Each structure stands twice: as structure tokens, then as C-alpha cells.
Amino acid sequence: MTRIIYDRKFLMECRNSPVTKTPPRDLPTIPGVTS
């Protein structure tokens, strides 16, 4: 019910989850951006 706030520490910690290693399914193919 309250505003969702994340500090830097928590956000960096979440990066260690294996799901972050999977590309977005509908990730466009663009040279020099996603290549």
C-alpha cells in the first residue's frame, strides 16, 4: 500500500539471481545496441 523504494545495496544484490542472466524473450536485434 506504500511506495516501493529500493536502495543501491539491495538492487545490486538482486543482480546475482540466475534469472538476470537470461535475455529478455522479445529483445530486439539492433546492431550496436543488442547486436
Binding site: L11, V19, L27, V33, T34
Partner: protein
Amino acid sequence: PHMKHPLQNRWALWFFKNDKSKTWQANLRLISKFDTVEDFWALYNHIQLSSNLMPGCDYSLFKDGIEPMWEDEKNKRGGRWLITLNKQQRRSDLDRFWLETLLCLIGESFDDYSDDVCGAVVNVRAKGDKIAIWTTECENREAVTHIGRVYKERLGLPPKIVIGYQSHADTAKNRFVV
């Protein structure tokens, strides 16, 4: 029962190439939308670093529903906190400054004033690079000032490195300075 951590807002990441031989619409491309922390990283981990973008290109992150243009209803009366960078800073500072900017946005790091945030833009250019946080109302001194102070703090800028807020109307001088 959340498996992924939801964000306060849904966000859209855009790419833009300043090709003046094409239309604005043709130059703009939606990379993806996301609404969780884990989906943000999945996106960030599989796109080019800003430091490796070709000159004349932009990345921008805006709240869903806000077009990445100052003509948008949410941007028309607004302004930006501007961070200017030398081209020589591109491989040392640009990426860490851009990422920290992204984390300030999706993390809602400006308390209640985070609602005034529309998005952020990074410009990669031959003359020099730019990062900016766009807000919705340049007249909201209290909101704008708080955002500027926290932003400077989060970038780790020393006090003597002063940053300015410019209304989009003027950009097309500084209203505020921190």
C-alpha cells in the same frame, strides 16, 4: 507471493539515433519495458554499454506512458538536471554515472518527489557526453531541488562539482544549481 521484486513504476527503455536524414519516429526504437528489479538487470545485462554507443545515439528510460520527447504532456513544462562529461570520461565515468542514474529512477530514490521524475537520458556525442534526469514541472522548486541534491549525492560528486537544472523551454541557462 512475489518471486521477482516489483517496482513502483513500469519503465520503458528507448534507443535513439540522431539521423537527420530520417524522421523522428523512424529514429526512435523501444528496446523493452520492465516492471521488476530482476527484469531490469536481465535487460541491462544484454544491451550495449553507453560508453560503447556510436556518437549521435541516445539511451532513455521513461515511465511507461511518457514519450521520450519534451513535447509530451508530462515533459512540456518540465526541465532536467544536467550532467556534462568530457569525451575522455567516456570509458571511466559514463557507464557508472548512467547506471547510478537508472538505479535512482527504478529505486524511487527521491522519496515523494520521485513522482516528479519523468525519466533520464544519456547522450553520446563527439563533442562530449550528457546524462540528465527529466522532471515534469520546472517551477516545483522544492521537488526539483531535492532531486538535484540527492542525485549529486548518489553520483558521489564532490561539493565543488556544481550541476544545474535547465527548463526545456530555455534549453530549446540554469534555473537552479546544487
